[PDB]
Ligand binder design. Structure first.
Ligand SMILES: c1ccc(C[n+]2ccc(-c3cc[n+](Cc4ccccc4)cc3)cc2)cc1
Ligand SMILES: c1ccc(C[n+]2ccc(-c3cc[n+](Cc4ccccc4)cc3)cc2)cc1
Ligand code: SF4
Ligand code: SF4
Ligand code: FES
Ligand code: FES
Lengths: 633, 633
């Protein structure tokens, strides 16, 4: 059980599932072995009915595809389509948010409103939309128009790429023709060039891949900015993590997915229907949370985080989980089957994301509350069946400090310098108390013992005075193991990082150091770490590829993670991935992604499956960047 | 050699290649066997780094994906991504044409102009763009704006879907939410919903797939309409087919790809540089043609068709092929390698479609002639090396009649009824001389003896009074075996079809029957067959699913072909495919594509790998539709 997940609560619920014969993800993974060499190394293509074409990594034929596609071209095309799929996911998420804002300022969905007025004004000014002398609805609709424009071609390029990167970085990207023209446009062109008979050069293909990763970066920032406008900009919050957030006597409602347009409304509406949950017998309605929509309502409402990706099923095995509200993404459809055994009621709410056997509730912004009131009642009814029955909640949970948006981070820093909030951070970078910055992002993965890479590399980095932030399932892994609890800054952080954190946190009326890891939100909110990093570059007058900033998708699983790592490389960062990417089948392609791309964007990939060696390689990247700045290390 | 291609010239050049050790596609296909059951049956997914997940078609585990994706969901997601890739190809083609028209009417590329004024006016009126009182450049720019709008969301849906189908058909499609909102939008949403953790219901997924096939249909029509505007609407032409179009003493220049924006300019410019080709020793410049751009210049300029998809390499083995101008699509990259042995100079001209080892010429509309003049010279220089050397051109070619655009077809029909050109065709449908209509479309495929399915099914249909049209590589297969020669109407056609063809052709001043097969252009120009079919439906006041019209992608290979077959199903047609699609791994998905979709669109798939049984099944579909209309059969 240790072999599967370092999460002790997950280890308990795995024993429950094995005892009851309810099949988990690890069981399916065991059933899948041995896995295919062609597929796991990228040497397989099916863009043709001319057959599935595999190339043996070594030995005699098959050496090449039937049409003449070499190993490098096949690998690059597959990787390109991975990036395109991730960009499509983030694009659709931000597109839905854009239509929500547009339908909100046009009287069409009264449940949605401009919560953060300063954020809207600042985004408009960055976009060049004039604010002074404009009604908030007109300027919000102008922002909403501008957001939708960025999906197609126009006069200006994708402004969520070109207005968010430092001008030097934008210029470097332009010099190679890497600035996107349209998010959906880049997606469609990638799907064009990777089809049979199209582009058949690895260098050209990978250049297009970088260009599409920037479309994904635009999608993430668009989603971040729009969610900030609609639902509020995160400010520091304190809540709990792991399955212990569940309580047997409440209606346990899990928000699962990625788009807050649904779950924020659920969170607000449920508190007033606790007026009705009492009569059903429960204390009230308990909105636990799963995955990045769970972290969206965590970062903006203090909602406890129940669990995350590879162990999402483990929320249900407790048997006290009544509802499961799904929008989309990183949802194992297995839950819909597992529900029949656990008594959970699975609900899907998107027209374009349905699971066979799962209840569908056609959700509209126009009826945002209505739907919600209905859905809660379902869970409430599902609690009535649970009356006076046995459940097994692992009495295990940790303390998490979150809501560290770039706004919140800079405000916390401004207590140390009012006129120059970035200067304290850069001062402590110079004097060695903060060595570098590392962003843990990305998924979990059934191939990696859950939360192993994140926690090990985080331990190593924190001992060595690295300021670590985290998003998505990386943030979930770090928070379920206590990395967001200042009470552990003592065990975890080095002396210099400890001094900086303890200065900032106690300066901000918190009364204690900032937590060992700065939870910066969901997967789309990786854009936040762009902003912050971008800001620092602007302050130093250098590009992102000169800063001691690295990223580590330590346990990546989803196509989104591949796209995110690619655009982390593109904007200039050393970017580690702790899962094998499907590139090993072509030495040239791996060489480009690890060595040659340094000469194009300044970033490069670090593919290390050993977290110890990965942490040393990240340390050496940070120390390289320190050396380039003529600083001690 | 018979086992590979029924094309006798191809059989000769295969012997040459084997004698010289130059590896062909069939050799690579032999090296690839045995092929993967998982991949060829759709039971493999790699949308995750959680491993390549395969499901055994029968037996024990692996039964399901690691995330819980059943066989049906995996199969549907793969098929959806195939359709998305095909729609991306056609979308990019039409998008490039749209920018060419926009850059032409805005003074930015003087080499391009509004060749067909009536076509532009008619398209504007259909779109609702007013013509009267507008300059041709302003209305052309309005059409160009409208074309680009259809890639993203707006107020109106994709107008190249909704303004081209009969209102009853559009209503049927709307009733199921199948009308696209944006070509690139549908592409991106498909790439979203097929990612991990997203949509996991086979019915829902296939509904989305139909909706995206309509985006592909819009892309094809957009390309057709734009190419008609830019370069002329096809009128009947006579030329030759197969490798015998090549001549040892000329500069043999092959246009290969799909976008005429390049090759039409090459065709026009080359005739004036024959003034320079004489001095190089050659007679002149011989613009043979390959694939659908070859058929574009065939249908609009009488350019001989050299060869097509699976045997494209066979153009080079002659050793007298000097140049190879590539834009994109269904180009085996192997040519770039094979050139080193054959002395051909391979040229790529698109920024987003490059082959390693192939000369790249960065082509712009702005420099359309300049590039062209350069490129020809290359070929001319490549002819100088060929001076006084041996070559092996199979002394084999056939006679092809083409240029039967829907405009040309209706004009030919109007000689029999001036006020009602469709009535003669429908009269002869009623009285049994024309039983049904069959559109042969789609690729060749190395798994099928080249041109076998097309020719066999065409023979059977023509004996039985079916009016057969053809596009793309289906048209190429039929023309290389003489199906476009009226001299064979005697051997091929039944008595009633013979009477109708002989009436129309001799009525049109041709002096002989129309050819046994009506070549209707390239793959995008399958939209033409939509128009014609749509018109007939409008004339009869019934939907497309009531007409004796079927389609047969008899030897499909490219993702485009899958998308085309899917939207042929969607608009109501019985649609055969003669290659195994990756659907067999899920009986529910195959059932939907073959049986249940009849209840949603009226069309259905016919998957038969035996051309005899396929022809009987097509005959029975046509006779079913005749029976539904209360007619003899
Ligand atoms: C030590 C040992 C094992 C690990 C975990 N691990 C890492 C990599 C692979 C693997 C397997 C097959 N390949 C094909 C291949 C290789 C070269 C060229 C082309 C293709 C690549 C890599 C398997 C397991 C980490 C550290
Ligand atoms: C007769 C004989 C042979 C042919 C040519 N042909 C047609 C089909 C297949 C084939 C192979 C494997 N399957 C897997 C499968 C089957 C059922 C359910 C799930 C999966 C499906 C089909 C192989 C060869 C045509 C006519
Ligand atoms: S398109 Fe080419 S590389 Fe891809 S599967 Fe078909 S033959 Fe192989
Ligand atoms: S995303 Fe799911 S179905 Fe697809 S390969 Fe990964 S585990 Fe298998
Ligand atoms: S051969 Fe296994 S992934 Fe295709
Ligand atoms: S297992 Fe062969 S196609 Fe994936």
């Amino acid at each position: 059980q240790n072999l599967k997940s370092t999460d002790r609560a997950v280890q308990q619920m795995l024993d429950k599932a094995k005892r009851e014969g309810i099949q988990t993800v690890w069981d399916r993974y065991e059933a899948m072995k041995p896995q295919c060499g062609f597929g796991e190394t990228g040497l397989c293509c099916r863009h043709c009915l001319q057959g599935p074409c595999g190339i043996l990594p070594f030995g005699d034929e098959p050496k090449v595809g039937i049409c003449g596609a070499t190993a490098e071209v096949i690998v690059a095309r597959g990787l390109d389509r991975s990036i395109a799929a991730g960009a499509a996911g983030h694009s659709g998420h931000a597109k839905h948010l854009a239509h929500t804002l547009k339908k909100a300022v046009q009287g069409k969905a009264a449940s949605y409103m401009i919560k953060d007025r300063t954020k809207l004004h600042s985004i408009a000014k960055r976009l060049g939309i004039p604010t002074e002398g404009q009604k908030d609805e007109d300027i919000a609709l102008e922002v909403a128009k501008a957001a939708l424009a960025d999906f197609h071609e126009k006069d200006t390029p994708v402004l969520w790429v070109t207005t968010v990167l430092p001008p030097s970085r934008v210029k470097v990207l332009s010099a190679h023709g890497l600035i996107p023209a349209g998010i959906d446009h880049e997606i469609a062109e990638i799907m064009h060039r990777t089809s049979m008979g199209c582009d058949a050069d690895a260098q050209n293909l990978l250049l297009g891949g970088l260009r599409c990763s920037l479309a994904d970066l635009a999608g993430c920032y668009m989603g971040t900015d729009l969610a900030d406008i609609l639902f509020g900009t995160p400010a520091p919050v304190v809540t709990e993590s792991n399955l212990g957030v569940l309580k047997a006597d409440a209606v346990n409602v899990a928000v699962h997915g990625h788009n807050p347009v649904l779950s924020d409304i659920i969170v607000s509406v449920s508190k007033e229907m606790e007026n009705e949950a009492r009569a059903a017998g429960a204390t009230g309605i308990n909105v636990v949370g799963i995955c990045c929509t769970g972290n969206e309502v965590l970062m903006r409402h203090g909602i406890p985080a129940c669990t995350h990706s590879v162990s999402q099923e483990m929320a249900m095995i407790t048997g006290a989980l009544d509802a499961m509200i799904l929008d989309y993404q990183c949802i194992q459809p297995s839950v819909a089957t597992i529900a029949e055994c656990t008594g959970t009621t699975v609900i899907t709410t998107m027209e374009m994301s349905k699971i066979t056997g799962a209840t569908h509730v056609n959700f509209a912004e126009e009826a945002a509350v209505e739907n919600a009131k209905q859905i809660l009642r379902l869970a409430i009814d599902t609690f009535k069946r649970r009356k006076g029955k046995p459940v097994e909640i692992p009495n295990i949970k940790t303390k998490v400090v979150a809501g560290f948006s770039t706004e919140a981070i800079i405000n916390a820093l401004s207590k140390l310098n009012a006129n120059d909030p970035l200067k304290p951070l850069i001062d402590n970078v110079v004097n060695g108390n903060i060595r570098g910055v590392c962003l843990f992002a990305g998924c979990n993965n059934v191939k990696v013992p859950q939360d192993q890479n994140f926690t090990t590399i985080a331990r190593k980095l924190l001992k060595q005075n690295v300021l670590v932030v985290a998003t998505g399932c990386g943030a979930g892994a770090l928070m379920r193991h206590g990395f967001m609890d200042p009470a552990n800054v003592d065990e975890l952080c080095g002396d210099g990082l400890k001094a900086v954190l303890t200065a900032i946190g106690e300066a901000n009326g918190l009364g204690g150091p900032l937590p060992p890891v700065l939870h910066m939100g969901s997967c789309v909110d990786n854009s936040r770490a762009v902003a912050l990093v971008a800001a620092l570059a602007n302050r130093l007058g250098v590009d992102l590829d000169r800063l001691p900033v690295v990223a580590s998708a330590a346990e990546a699983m989803h196509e989104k993670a591949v796209a995110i790592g690619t655009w982390a490389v593109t904007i200039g960062l050393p970017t580690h991935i702790g899962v094998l990417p499907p590139i090993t089948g072509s030495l040239p392609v791996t060489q480009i992604l690890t060595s040659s791309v340094k000469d194009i964007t300044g970033g490069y990939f670090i593919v290390e499956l050993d977290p110890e060696t990965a942490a040393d390689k990240l340390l050496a990247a940070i120390n390289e960047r320190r050396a380039g700045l003529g600083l001690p290390w």
